[PDB]
Design an enzyme around this catalytic site. Structure first.
Site, mmCIF file in Angstrom:
data_model
loop_
_atom_site.group_PDB
_atom_site.id
_atom_site.type_symbol
_atom_site.label_atom_id
_atom_site.label_comp_id
_atom_site.label_asym_id
_atom_site.label_seq_id
_atom_site.Cartn_x
_atom_site.Cartn_y
_atom_site.Cartn_z
ATOM 1 N N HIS A 57 0.821 -1.221 0.000
ATOM 2 C CA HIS A 57 0.000 0.000 0.000
ATOM 3 C C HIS A 57 0.858 1.277 0.000
ATOM 4 O O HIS A 57 0.368 2.379 -0.298
ATOM 5 C CB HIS A 57 -1.032 -0.004 1.142
ATOM 6 C CG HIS A 57 -0.466 0.318 2.497
ATOM 7 N ND1 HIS A 57 -0.122 -0.654 3.414
ATOM 8 C CD2 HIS A 57 -0.213 1.504 3.097
ATOM 9 C CE1 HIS A 57 0.324 -0.080 4.516
ATOM 10 N NE2 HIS A 57 0.280 1.229 4.349
ATOM 11 N N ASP A 81 0.278 -7.696 1.543
ATOM 12 C CA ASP A 81 0.641 -6.268 1.532
ATOM 13 C C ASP A 81 2.164 -6.068 1.691
ATOM 14 O O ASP A 81 2.623 -5.093 2.283
ATOM 15 C CB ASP A 81 -0.151 -5.524 2.617
ATOM 16 C CG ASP A 81 -0.011 -4.020 2.536
ATOM 17 O OD1 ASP A 81 0.294 -3.488 1.434
ATOM 18 O OD2 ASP A 81 -0.207 -3.373 3.597
ATOM 19 N N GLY A 137 2.809 6.760 8.422
ATOM 20 C CA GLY A 137 4.120 6.851 7.780
ATOM 21 C C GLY A 137 5.129 5.901 8.385
ATOM 22 O O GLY A 137 6.309 5.929 8.029
ATOM 23 N N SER A 139 4.546 2.446 8.504
ATOM 24 C CA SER A 139 4.412 1.096 7.940
ATOM 25 C C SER A 139 5.748 0.686 7.317
ATOM 26 O O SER A 139 6.441 1.515 6.733
ATOM 27 C CB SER A 139 3.278 1.007 6.912
ATOM 28 O OG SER A 139 3.509 1.904 5.832
HETATM 29 O O1 LIG Z 1 -7.125 -1.339 7.996
HETATM 30 C C1 LIG Z 1 -6.742 -1.213 9.163
HETATM 31 N N1 LIG Z 1 -6.336 -0.017 9.706
HETATM 32 C C2 LIG Z 1 -5.970 1.137 8.877
HETATM 33 C C3 LIG Z 1 -6.086 2.442 9.696
HETATM 34 C C4 LIG Z 1 -5.775 3.638 8.763
HETATM 35 C C5 LIG Z 1 -5.548 4.921 9.598
HETATM 36 C C6 LIG Z 1 -4.063 5.349 9.535
HETATM 37 C C7 LIG Z 1 -3.284 4.585 10.623
HETATM 38 C C8 LIG Z 1 -1.760 4.825 10.621
HETATM 39 C C9 LIG Z 1 -0.760 3.920 10.556
HETATM 40 C C10 LIG Z 1 -0.699 2.622 9.797
HETATM 41 C C11 LIG Z 1 0.579 1.820 9.618
HETATM 42 C C12 LIG Z 1 -0.082 2.477 8.420
HETATM 43 C C13 LIG Z 1 0.606 3.625 7.713
HETATM 44 O O2 LIG Z 1 1.313 4.487 8.418
HETATM 45 N N2 LIG Z 1 0.611 3.623 6.384
HETATM 46 S S1 LIG Z 1 1.532 4.784 5.574
HETATM 47 O O3 LIG Z 1 1.111 6.123 6.001
HETATM 48 O O4 LIG Z 1 2.952 4.419 5.733
HETATM 49 C C14 LIG Z 1 1.095 4.537 3.795
HETATM 50 C C15 LIG Z 1 2.194 3.827 3.027
HETATM 51 C C16 LIG Z 1 1.999 5.318 2.864
HETATM 52 N N3 LIG Z 1 -0.827 1.652 7.509
HETATM 53 C C17 LIG Z 1 -2.010 1.967 6.871
HETATM 54 O O5 LIG Z 1 -2.419 3.121 6.761
HETATM 55 C C18 LIG Z 1 -2.965 0.870 6.382
HETATM 56 C C19 LIG Z 1 -3.170 0.892 4.855
HETATM 57 C C20 LIG Z 1 -4.602 0.366 4.704
HETATM 58 O O6 LIG Z 1 -4.622 -1.062 4.746
HETATM 59 C C21 LIG Z 1 -4.038 -1.805 3.830
HETATM 60 O O7 LIG Z 1 -3.869 -1.443 2.665
HETATM 61 N N4 LIG Z 1 -4.060 -3.132 4.197
HETATM 62 C C22 LIG Z 1 -4.844 -3.574 5.354
HETATM 63 C C23 LIG Z 1 -3.984 -4.563 6.129
HETATM 64 C C24 LIG Z 1 -3.865 -5.799 5.278
HETATM 65 C C25 LIG Z 1 -3.876 -7.074 5.886
HETATM 66 C C26 LIG Z 1 -3.769 -8.206 5.059
HETATM 67 C C27 LIG Z 1 -3.658 -8.051 3.660
HETATM 68 C C28 LIG Z 1 -3.656 -6.772 3.059
HETATM 69 C C29 LIG Z 1 -3.769 -5.632 3.878
HETATM 70 C C30 LIG Z 1 -3.771 -4.232 3.253
HETATM 71 C C31 LIG Z 1 -5.343 0.916 5.932
HETATM 72 N N5 LIG Z 1 -4.309 1.006 6.971
HETATM 73 C C32 LIG Z 1 -4.552 0.929 8.319
HETATM 74 O O8 LIG Z 1 -3.649 0.767 9.140
HETATM 75 O O9 LIG Z 1 -6.775 -2.174 10.059
HETATM 76 C C33 LIG Z 1 -7.341 -3.433 9.715
HETATM 77 C C34 LIG Z 1 -6.301 -4.298 8.994
HETATM 78 C C35 LIG Z 1 -5.532 -4.990 10.131
HETATM 79 C C36 LIG Z 1 -6.416 -4.900 11.384
HETATM 80 C C37 LIG Z 1 -7.724 -4.206 10.980
#
Ligand SMILES: O=C(N[C@H]1CCCCCCC[C@@H]2C[C@@]2(C(=O)NS(=O)(=O)C2CC2)NC(=O)[C@@H]2C[C@@H](OC(=O)N3CCc4ccccc4C3)CN2C1=O)OC1CCCC1
Ligand SMILES: [Zn+2]
Lengths: 175, 13
Positions: A57, A81, A137, A139
């Site tokens: 992602h 992911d 940010g 991840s």
């Molecule tokens: O969906 C979430 N939660 C969201 C909450 C979004 C609000 C922002 C939270 C903040 C922090 C979090 C680490 C992070 C991030 O910093 N990303 S980042 O800014 O570095 C981006 C690269 C530039 N990842 C996220 O923001 C993820 C991305 C999205 O989820 C994914 O794309 N996943 C969901 C997890 C998963 C699990 C299995 C297979 C595929 C996937 C794909 C929602 N997210 C999430 O983390 O949680 C679900 C999945 C696991 C347990 C329930």
């Protein structure tokens, strides 16, 4: 576990737009955790056993800028992911975890090390809840055991009403 | 474009 972290920026934005367009990185890579960026978003990577690992992602299927040109993604697992590139020379790999400890430590982009209690293969709880904006940010950043070895990389924040209370991560065995 | 290493996190302890 007296694990601490310190962040060092090696590039500005202009240098990032330029290195992104070319695919050619002039800089000398050091360390085990890399701070990554496409021109438009920023996240982390962790080098483990030869490969620079990060989230899909974040990276998509994009190439990583390397010493002698763009490095193609050797590994892509969209189901998990996860993406990986063969690590550029200079990037040291972390040693995978042994103690099988459930007391973990998440390393964020702001150089903080957060205590996390392992709840399953991919789940741990934050001992202290954190604001969502604080974890964005980070991840790709590692979860380390008390001895300091990688057990996985941060994937997603588990939230309870607007606040992160747990972390979902890609285990080291998955890589 | 490519993904770019813009920094690093140095670990200790
Ligand atoms: O969906 C979430 N939660 C969201 C909450 C979004 C609000 C922002 C939270 C903040 C922090 C979090 C680490 C992070 C991030 O910093 N990303 S980042 O800014 O570095 C981006 C690269 C530039 N990842 C996220 O923001 C993820 C991305 C999205 O989820 C994914 O794309 N996943 C969901 C997890 C998963 C699990 C299995 C297979 C595929 C996937 C794909 C929602 N997210 C999430 O983390 O949680 C679900 C999945 C696991 C347990 C329930
Ligand atoms: Zn361990």
């Amino acid at each position: 576990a007296p694990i601490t972290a310190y962040s060092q920026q090696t590039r500005g934005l202009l240098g990032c737009i330029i290195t992104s367009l070319t695919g050619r990185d002039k800089n000398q890579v050091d360390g085990e955790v890399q701070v990554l960026s496409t021109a438009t978003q920023s996240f982390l990577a962790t080098c483990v056993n030869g490969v620079c690992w990060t989230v899909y992602h974040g990276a998509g299927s994009k190439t990583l800028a390397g010493p002698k040109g763009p490095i193609t993604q050797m590994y892509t697992n969209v189901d998990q992911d996860l993406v990986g590139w063969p690590a550029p020379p200079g990037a040291r790999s972390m040693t995978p975890c042994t103690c099988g400890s459930s007391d973990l430590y998440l390393v964020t982009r702001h150089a903080d090390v957060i205590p996390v209690r392992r709840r399953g293969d991919s789940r741990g709880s934050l001992l202290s809840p954190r604001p969502v904006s604080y974890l964005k940010g980070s991840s790709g950043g590692p979860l380390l055991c008390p001895s300091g070895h990688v057990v996985g990389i941060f994937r997603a924040a588990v939230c309870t009403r607007g606040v992160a209370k747990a972390v979902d991560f890609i285990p080291v065995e998955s890589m | 474009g490519s993904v770019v290493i813009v920094g690093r996190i140095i670990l200790s302890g």
